[PDB]
Amino acid sequence: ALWQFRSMIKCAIPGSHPLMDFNNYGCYCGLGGSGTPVDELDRCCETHDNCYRDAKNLDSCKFLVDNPYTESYSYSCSNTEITCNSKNNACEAFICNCDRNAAICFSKAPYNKEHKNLDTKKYC
Ligand SMILES: [Ca+2]
């Protein structure tokens, strides 16, 4: 889940907005655009998209029409670090693993907060 990993993405960035620091960014990070990224940090948004979807195809969730931003969450928060859920059928918990390893790219990665604010021309 996207709003539900976006409580804890503001624990992840002590920080401010969970996305919008990402929505626009290098190309598209988390929300906005489409194509390929720029940063190591923007790569976990090519896959918070490419491992985010696949609930739609899932071994554990056979149904078509999940929507790429929706399924999981039952979390936490510490210093800046959470957990994900406390139940696990892949329907939620597979999507929850894509969300938290993106909270880890997004809190930390080989980050650069530098190509914010952008466009997709120079950028994508
Ligand atoms: Ca995107």
UniProtKB/Swiss-Prot annotation:
It catalyses: a 1,2-diacyl-sn-glycero-3-phosphocholine + H2O = a 1-acyl-sn-glycero-3-phosphocholine + a fatty acid + H(+); 1,2-ditetradecanoyl-sn-glycero-3-phosphocholine + H2O = 2-tetradecanoyl-sn-glycero-3-phosphocholine + tetradecanoate + H(+); 1,2-dihexadecanoyl-sn-glycero-3-phosphocholine + H2O = 1-hexadecanoyl-sn-glycero-3-phosphocholine + hexadecanoate + H(+); 1-hexadecanoyl-2-(9Z-octadecenoyl)-sn-glycero-3-phosphocholine + H2O = 1-hexadecanoyl-sn-glycero-3-phosphocholine + (9Z)-octadecenoate + H(+). Its cofactor is Ca(2+). Ca(2+) binds at Y28, G30, G32, D49. Binds 1 Ca(2+) ion per subunit. The active site is at H48, D99. One of its GO terms (molecular function) is signaling receptor binding. Its EC number is 3.1.1.4. Acylation causes dimerization. Activated by trypsin cleavage in the duodenum. Can also be activated by thrombin or autocatalytically. A lipid is attached at K56 (N6-palmitoyl lysine). GO terms for cellular component: cell surface; extracellular region. Loss of activity upon alkylation of His-48 with p-bromo phenacyl bromide; Ca(2+) and Ba(2+) protect against inactivation. Belongs to the phospholipase A2 family. Monomer or homodimer. Secretory calcium-dependent phospholipase A2 that primarily targets dietary phospholipids in the intestinal tract. Hydrolyzes the ester bond of the fatty acyl group attached at sn-2 position of phospholipids (phospholipase A2 activity) with preference for phosphatidylethanolamines and phosphatidylglycerols over phosphatidylcholines. May play a role in the biosynthesis of N-acyl ethanolamines that regulate energy metabolism and inflammation in the intestinal tract. This is Phospholipase A2, major isoenzyme. It comes from Sus scrofa (Pig). The lineage of its organism: Eukaryota, Metazoa, Chordata, Craniata, Vertebrata. The chain holds residues 23 to 146 of 146 of the full protein.
